[PDB]
Design a binder for this molecule. Sequence first.
Ligand SMILES: *P(=O)(O)OCC(C)(C)[C@@H](O)C(=O)NCCC(=O)NCCS
Lengths: 147, 147, 72, 134, 135
Amino acid sequence: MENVQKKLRKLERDYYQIREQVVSAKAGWCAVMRMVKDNGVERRLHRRELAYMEGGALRSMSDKALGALRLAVADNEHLRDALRLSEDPKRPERKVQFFIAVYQHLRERIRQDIIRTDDPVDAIEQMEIELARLTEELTAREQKLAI
Amino acid sequence: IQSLTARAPVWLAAQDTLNQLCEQSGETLASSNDVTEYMQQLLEREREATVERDEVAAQKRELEKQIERLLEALNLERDALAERYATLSFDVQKIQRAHQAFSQFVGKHLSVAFDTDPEAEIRELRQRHTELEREVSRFEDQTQQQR
Amino acid sequence: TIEERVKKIIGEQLGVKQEEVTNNASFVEDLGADSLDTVELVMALEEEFDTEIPDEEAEKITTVQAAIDYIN
Amino acid sequence: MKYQQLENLECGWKWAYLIRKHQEGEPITKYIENSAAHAAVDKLIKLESEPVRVLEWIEQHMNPDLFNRMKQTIRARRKRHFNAEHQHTRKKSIDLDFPVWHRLSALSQRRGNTLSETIVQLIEDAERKEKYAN
Amino acid sequence: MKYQQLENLECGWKWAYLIRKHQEGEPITKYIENSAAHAAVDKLIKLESEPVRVLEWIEQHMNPDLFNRMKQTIRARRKRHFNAEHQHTRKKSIDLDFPVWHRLSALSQRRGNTLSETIVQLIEDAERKEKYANQ
DNA sequence: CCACTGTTACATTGTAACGGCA
DNA sequence: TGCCGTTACAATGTAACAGTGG
Ligand SMILES: *P(=O)(O)OCC(C)(C)[C@@H](O)C(=O)NCCC(=O)NCCS
């Protein structure tokens, strides 16, 4: 029975390790949850469809998205730097910051003179309107130049 | 729960696009009959807009030729026609884009659209696992003591 | 004093600040922490004080004040 | 294979490692003539943001003698990157005075244990002696 | 001061530190303007073979942030350079698993002594057991 | 007081040597 | 054998504490 007591002690130390894991995880979650509440988590990040997918596939999906972002963000330099920093696995919050750093940047370059939608996802429609208008202007300009 | 869990991811993704698609429109989709009704509203809007788009295009071409032969009043009208033509041009594009999403939405997700949330059942059934566990303990206790 | 532990940890586990919690309120509904969050809070309290709290006693911490009542 | 390998991550690791080595003066390329080496290094520098082509660059121009060092560096990077997620799998680095380290390594070699195992055993024996006395 | 300060060595150390920091991308300069920063870095590069002028370049263009890190790194480098002479003054680097290091650090903080002293005490108790077994 | 120096406890990255396994 | 995890270092950079003298 003393061996069973020692086994219980082993179980208790394993429990101690698991509890430390969980409490540290929540301590980390605190700030990321506080910052993501700027509409980030409402529907964008929390793709609840993925709640039933093993981390093995999620890692590959994030890796593929990172590969695409490398090419996409080549022109920008501050966004490139933020993406570079966001690869550390011991500073999770940085990833969310990058998302914010995108939207904020995507909000600065809106050229709000003729656009209003703060959310860039809805700025695509106004951009398409702008391209149509500019194509008509291009036709008019070409005719004037010819004459 | 093993069956329901396998059902959660497909259902969950299907409704998430619906809500995103719902946000793209001014109405709420909660039935197959409603979807067809809104789709026809979408299609009829499409036919009307192209008729008006063609109408304004006829007006623009006539005014463009009038200016070509030659004035400011003609330029002012042409600019107004370009503004109206652009405004109606995007309307046809958006309505066509909205229909395409609806067609794809019904092509793929119509099998599980507007269905019961399997997460709720999984939550309830899993809650029965624990409440069943009490029956395990309170019948294990009886056999431990009475013996 | 020693309560600074609890009134600190609570916030660190719920996203609220030290003074946000009110003794009259309840964690379950008046702080926004759901079942999982309250389990995490009680278990973090268990970790901090290097002690144990069974399920029955642990379930009696739904109110803010209780977190200190069993401690002191 | 214990840790899954991700291409867009390990390729960035390899590019960074090669750029670091080049900045340190190490000969990255197999070309003794300086012109070809400079051309290959420029190709690598402008090759940023590409896994599928940095792999080919390594296959084509990489110095033969650096393959083993790069492979083991990437091995260590992968293991550390995956282990740094949880506290218990991390490693704590300390500096020990040479006499103390000499004695500890003597014990570890004598008993066949590692430094971590040796310290665990020593602490456990100290605790057992405490309990004996107490 | 226990370690002799050598000017022509520490100046080279400082110059190398500045160059490493710059090539790593950090803003060693105190200038926000791009042109002045580039000119200052170029002058520092020219100062490669004149470590003596590096002190003046530091006082003229060094970022105010880096003084503490500078005084830390060169101080540590001096200590290490002078200790490397003899083995018995050297340091050995080892890696410890989190549980083992946690227990060891808790024990050391309990006894109020450094890690090497705690390891000495543990190995000395083990060696005392071995000695009394030997006698 | 204040600054400068010595020391310890980490982190960060790289490398060589073992040993397991297809 | 060649890849892959793992250990035990080396070299350098930093933060924090303890001393020392101006
Ligand atoms: P709620 O929807 O936040 O879910 C809470 C939970 C079921 C995930 C779980 O954290 C919980 O609160 N369980 C109750 C305690 C329990 O089940 N203990 C089992 C000990 S073996």
